[PDB]
Design a protein around this ligand. Structure first.
Ligand SMILES: CCOC(=O)N1CCC[C@H](C(=O)Nc2ccc(Cl)c(F)c2)C1
Ligand SMILES: *[C@@H]1O[C@H](CO)[C@@H](O)[C@H](O)[C@H]1NC(C)=O
Ligand SMILES: *[C@@H]1O[C@H](CO)[C@@H](O)[C@H](O)[C@H]1NC(C)=O
Ligand SMILES: *[C@@H]1O[C@H](CO)[C@@H](O)[C@H](O)[C@H]1NC(C)=O
Ligand SMILES: *[C@@H]1O[C@H](CO)[C@@H](O)[C@H](O)[C@H]1NC(C)=O
Ligand SMILES: *[C@@H]1O[C@H](CO)[C@@H](O)[C@H](O)[C@H]1NC(C)=O
Ligand SMILES: *[C@@H]1O[C@H](CO)[C@@H](O)[C@H](O)[C@H]1NC(C)=O
Ligand SMILES: *[C@@H]1O[C@H](CO)[C@@H](O)[C@H](O)[C@H]1NC(C)=O
Ligand SMILES: *[C@@H]1O[C@H](CO)[C@@H](O)[C@H](O)[C@H]1NC(C)=O
Ligand SMILES: *[C@@H]1O[C@H](CO)[C@@H](O)[C@H](O)[C@H]1NC(C)=O
Ligand SMILES: *[C@@H]1O[C@H](CO)[C@@H](O)[C@H](O)[C@H]1NC(C)=O
Length: 340
């Protein structure tokens, strides 16, 4: 084969069930085709191919899809956008993300980087071709990347430019850490439980990896410094409910009698600032009974403080808010090429 770099409109594929009322299933039933029943991955002999996860139009395309999914599926009692108000009915929905495959039309193919320690930019030596990506769950969150894929070998630091502190850092974990979030049967009070032993061990490895990238400086974690609640809290959607969880206990440099269960305090919020950047939305109060989601932490979103150039330290704070980084954390090993 012979190819050239190119962008083109993708289509999606999924295992969505036509009988489900769950909203990702409904969306994917009418906006995606069924998954490839016979996927074939073709290794490319003696092929080195350069990738750049930070300039990858697949990310913008998935982002457009997820905006469309949420716009079609979430039913606010009151939308507030641009100096407008839209009232409507806001019934409780069934919400649980399903994997979505992204696929090339005729004349194009997806190249896949299989170097286990590939950081997202530069040459890839073990390159395969695929017709569709693997199935990516479109999980919206801040601070912690949830229910994703794990790095196969070492923890990976991904950034467009580590030297530029305005550029988000994506940490790719090699070992998931469960986060178990419950609103038990104050109806908005909730909590998340994490195994502190595993978390602290993983976070210690993360600090050592950051030390490799920052000329051995001391790595310090601190809580976010201002912003909207969606960014200063780990925010995510559990069964249709918007959870906001305080992570100060996770970014604790002293534990880097503290090896039991970490319990993060959370609140379910009805009024949110939408990640589509469109303004505020109000939803109904939470459903009755026990509301529970067990998720895998598979990545971390970090921002490094500026102004530490002449100091002995680098300090990192949980970040997020641009969901493109969530999609990028999974699309990093893929790029579209035009077959020539
Ligand atoms: C570029 C930095 O971010 C922003 O400027 N934003 C504006 C205000 C907060 C927005 C947000 O993140 N909303 C959100 C909503 C629901 C869930 Cl479940 C969630 F995880 C995140 C993003
Ligand atoms: C290339 O990646 C494949 C995964 O597709 C894996 O078996 C191995 O790491 C590599 N194999 C070869 C022959 O390079
Ligand atoms: C990623 O790898 C390339 C070498 O291909 C290097 O130039 C770049 O600094 C690396 N970035 C990170 C964040 O490790
Ligand atoms: C959580 O991680 C394990 C591997 O660490 C994986 O087998 C399991 O399927 C993951 N769960 C989810 C919901 O992704
Ligand atoms: C995870 O990566 C670190 C290096 O960043 C390594 O020390 C550790 O052995 C890895 N763990 C697993 C389970 O691969
Ligand atoms: C990375 O960021 C630093 C500081 O913002 C800047 O001086 C440098 O030119 C950037 N490097 C690249 C390759 O963009
Ligand atoms: C999650 O936590 C709840 C209550 O904290 C508990 O009942 C449940 O067994 C936990 N599930 C897992 C998988 O740890
Ligand atoms: C907490 O993590 C430790 C260390 O990895 C592990 O032995 C144990 O399975 C976890 N705790 C429980 C109650 O499973
Ligand atoms: C960083 O510290 C490590 C500690 O193992 C050492 O091996 C290495 O020489 C140091 N590198 C720099 C650039 O300071
Ligand atoms: C998180 O909890 C700490 C105390 O545990 C508190 O000082 C901090 O203000 C909380 N974060 C936010 C965003 O309220
Ligand atoms: C992660 O996956 C599990 C298993 O499908 C699910 O129960 C959980 O709610 C998911 N978490 C989020 C935040 O979607």
């Amino acid at each position: 084969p012979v190819w050239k770099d190119a962008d083109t409109t993708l289509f999606c594929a999924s295992d969505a069930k036509a009988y489900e009322t769950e909203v990702h299933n409904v969306w994917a039933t009418h906006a995606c085709v069924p998954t490839d029943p016979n996927p074939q991955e073709i290794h490319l002999e003696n092929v080195t191919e350069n990738f750049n996860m930070w300039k990858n139009n697949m990310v913008e395309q998935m982002h457009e899809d997820i905006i469309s999914l949420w716009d079609q599926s979430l039913q606010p009692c009151v939308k507030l956008t641009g100096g407008s108000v839209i009232k409507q009915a806001c019934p409780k929905i069934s919400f649980d993300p399903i994997p979505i495959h992204y696929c090339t039309p005729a004349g194009y193919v997806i190249l896949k980087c299989n170097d286990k320690n590939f950081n997202g930019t530069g040459p890839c030596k073990n390159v395969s071709s695929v017709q569709c990506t693997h199935g990516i769950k479109p999980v919206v969150s801040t601070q912690l990347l949830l229910n994703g894929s794990l790095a196969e070998e070492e923890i990976i630091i991904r950034s467009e430019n580590l030297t530029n502190n305005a550029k988000t850092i994506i940490v790719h974990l090699n070992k998931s850490v469960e986060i178990n979030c419950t609103r038990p049967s104050d109806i908005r009070k909730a909590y998340c439980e994490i195994n502190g032993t595993k978390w602290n061990k993983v976070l210690k490895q993360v600090t050592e990896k950051l030390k490799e990238h920052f000329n051995n400086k001391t790595i310090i974690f601190q809580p976010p410094s201002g912003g909207d609640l969606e960014i200063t809290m780990h925010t995510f959607n559990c069964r249709g409910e918007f959870f906001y969880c305080n992570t100060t206990q996770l970014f604790n440099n002293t534990c880097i009698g503290c090896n039991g269960t970490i319990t993060l305090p959370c609140k379910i919020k009805q009024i949110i600032n939408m990640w589509q950047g469109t303004g505020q939305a109000m939803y109904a109060p939470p459903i009755d009974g026990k509301i529970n989601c067990v998720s895998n932490i598979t990545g971390i979103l970090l921002t490094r403080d500026g102004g530490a150039n002449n100091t002995s330290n680098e300090t990192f704070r949980p970040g997020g808010g641009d969901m493109r980084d969530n999609w990028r954390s999974e699309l990093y090993k893929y790029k579209v090429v035009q077959i020539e």
